[PDB]
Amino acid sequence: SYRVVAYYISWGAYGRSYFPSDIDYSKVTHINYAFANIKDGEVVVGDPGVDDGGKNNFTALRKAKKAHPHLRNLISVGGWSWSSGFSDAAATPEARKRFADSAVAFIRKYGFDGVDIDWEYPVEGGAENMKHRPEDKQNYTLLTRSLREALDTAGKADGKYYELTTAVWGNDKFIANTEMDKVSRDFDFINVMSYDFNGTWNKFSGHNAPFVNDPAYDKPGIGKTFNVVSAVEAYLKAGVPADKLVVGVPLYGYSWKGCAAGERNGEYQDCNGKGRGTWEDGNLDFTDIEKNLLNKKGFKRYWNDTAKAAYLYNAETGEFVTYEDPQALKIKLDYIKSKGLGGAMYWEITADRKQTLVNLIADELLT
Numbered sequence: 167s168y169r170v171v172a173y174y175i176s177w178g179a180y181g182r183s184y185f186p187s188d189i190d191y192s193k194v195t196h197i198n199y200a201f202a203n204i205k206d207g208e209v210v211v212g213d214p215g216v217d218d219g220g221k222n223n224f225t226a227l228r229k230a231k232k233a234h235p236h237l238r239n240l241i242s243v244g245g246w247s248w249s250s251g252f253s254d255a256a257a258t259p260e261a262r263k264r265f266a267d268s269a270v271a272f273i274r275k276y277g278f279d280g281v282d283i284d285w286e287y288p289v290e291g292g293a294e295n296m297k298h299r300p301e302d303k304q305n306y307t308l309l310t311r312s313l314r315e316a317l318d319t320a321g322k323a324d325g326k327y328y329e330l331t332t333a334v335w336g337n338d339k340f341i342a343n344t345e346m347d348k349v350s351r352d353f354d355f356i357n358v359m360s361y362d363f364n365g366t367w368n369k370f371s372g373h374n375a376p377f378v379n380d381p382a383y384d385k386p387g388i389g390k391t392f393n394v395v396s397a398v399e400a401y402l403k404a405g406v407p408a409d410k411l412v413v414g415v416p417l418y419g420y421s422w423k424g425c426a427a428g429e430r431n432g433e434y435q436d437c438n439g440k441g442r443g444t445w446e447d448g449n450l451d452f453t454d455i456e457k458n459l460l461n462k463k464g465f466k467r468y469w470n471d472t473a474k475a476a477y478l479y480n481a482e483t484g485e486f487v488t489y490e491d492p493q494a495l496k497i498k499l500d501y502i503k504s505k506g507l508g509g510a511m512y513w514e515i516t517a518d519r520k521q522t523l524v525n526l527i528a529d530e531l532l533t
Contacts, residue, residue, distance in 0.1 A: 168502065168531035169509030171196040171331075171357055171412055172524075173242065175516060179216040179223055182445070184516035186226035191234040193521065193528040197227065198242045198282045198331075198357075200514065204251025207261055208268035209243050209281075218276060228277040240329060241272060242282040246293050249286040253297045256305035262312035269313060270320040273328060280329030281313060282357070287335050289343035307349045314352040329354040333511075336360050336414070338391050338400045347405030356406050357511040361416040363392040364488065366440045366448045371425050371432055371486040374416055376473035377497055383434050383473070393473070394498060398505065412508040413498060415527070417517035419450040419489030425479070431468050432479035432486040441485040444517075451517040455489050469493065492526055499530040 172194045178184040189197065203212045211217045218224050227239050244252060255265040269281045286292040288302035299305075310330070317328040330352060334340050336359050350356065364372030370385050379390045391400065394413065401411055424438025440448030450459070455478070459465040465478040465487065476491030502510060510527050518524050 169195045169355060169412055169511075170527055170531055171198060171355075171509065171511035173198045173200050173512065173514040175200050175514050176213050176216050176223055178516040179221040182516050184519075185221065186223050186230055189230065189515060190521060190524070191230050191237050193524050193532070194515075195236070195509070195532070196238045196240060197230075197515075198240050198511075199223070199227065199278070200242045201245045201248055201284065202241045202243045202272060203248045204243065204255060204265075207251065207255050207264045209241070209265065209272045210268075212248065224276045231277065238279040238329060239277070240280045240282045240331060241276070241278045242284050242333070243269070244284040244286060246286050247295075249284070249292050250295050250297045252285045252288075252309070253299050253302055253305070256309035257299065257301060259312075262309050263316075265309065266312040266316035270316050270328075274320070274324070279326070280317065280331065280354070282331045282333060283310070283313070284333040287340055287343065291335065291337065291339060303343050303345065307345045310349045310352045331355050331357060333357045333359055334401065336363055336392075336397045338397070341400055341404045346401060350406050350410060353410065355410045355412050355508045356401065357412045358397055358401055358414050359513070360394040360397045360414045361513070364388070365420045366422060370434060370436050371422050371477075372434060372488065373470070373473050373475040373477070374420050374488040375490060375494070376470070376475045377494060377501075378472070378474060380470060380473040385434060395501070398501075398507070402505075408506040408508070410508050412511045413502055415495060415498065415510055415512045415523065416490050417452045417512050417514060417523055419452070419455055419487050421448050421450055421488075422486045424484040425486040426484070427479070427481060431466070431481075432484065433468065433470065433477055435486070437484065437486065441483075441487065450487060450489065451519075452489065452523055453517060453519040455487060456520060456522060459487060467491070490523060492522065495523055495526055496530070499527065502531070
């Protein structure tokens with residue numbers, strides 16, 4: 167009944183030394199490969215050093231498909247850094263056909279089973295380099311339609327079914343800026359990025375993925391919809407069918423340093439910038455939290471029983487960590503089942519080497 171959609175990051179094949187051969191494919195239904203880029207209106211190889219050459223991640227994913235007939239591998243196009251080409255690609259029938267034909271050509275040449283559209287984000291939002299136009303709201307629908315038609319035609323030619331999915335913002339601005347009731351019919355499933363609700367863009371601490379609204383969290387401009395249940399309910403109301411709605415989970419955490427304790431052990435407090443990270447300041451792999459911080463080395467675990475979220479606080483350094491604890495993740499997996507949702511998605515599989523969260527998701531949703 168349930169999907170388990172794991173993002174694999176191409177750059178895992180650098181210093182992380184986590185290759186597709188390292189994935190336990192028994193723990194997933196789908197791998198989304200992050201990412202393909204857009205160049206001159208076409209889907210292109212994101213990183214020739216690790217994708218179709220060099221470390222040859224694509225070869226490794228095709229090997230995995232042969233070893234695991236259940237497995238479906240999708241190419242994720244865009245993401246935070248590489249979304250700047252979508253607005254142009256979507257804007258005219260000619261641009262949409264050029265884009266869609268390039269997506270089909272890509273999955274045929276590299277052995278993928280479909281396309282995940284990670285457009286961050288239509289109309290407004292995204293990276294400093296991001297490009298938008300008001301017409302994105304309707305053009306997201308039209309680009310999706312062009313892709314679905316091209317993939318239908320190619321699948322009939324190829325004797326295969328090709329999937330078409332999307333990653334959608336946890337922020338309900340995305341719903342205001344799209345037609346989820348019109349476009350849902352062309353996506354096999356919709357990966358809700360029900361995380362990144364709080365982070366070091368705020369000078370104060372908070373939870374990356376609180377389950378429900380905590381009214382005790384009353385910092386400027388951060389309202390009552392920045393939580394998993396609000397995001398799920400918003401997409402259902404917008405016309406995403408429950409069975410297509412896949413709930414995103416983070417396998418990373420965010421950290422701040424120099425957070426005041428207040429009377430909440432550092433929670434919702436003013437801080438002094440990013441805390442320690444794994445591969446960059448302020449961003450921790452679950453592996454690192456689990457090995458080095460979780461009730462370890464002056465970091466103490468606390469549980470917010472309103473938000474249903476765990477955090478770590480080091481009173482000596484004022485470092486605050488938001489991360490996905492098994493206690494929170496079990497609540498989310500029960501919620502998926504209760505609401506008849508499409509399963510779970512996670513960013514990203516390299517960040518949990520002991521498969522603590524990976525195994526809980528697989529145990530609860532697969533059988």
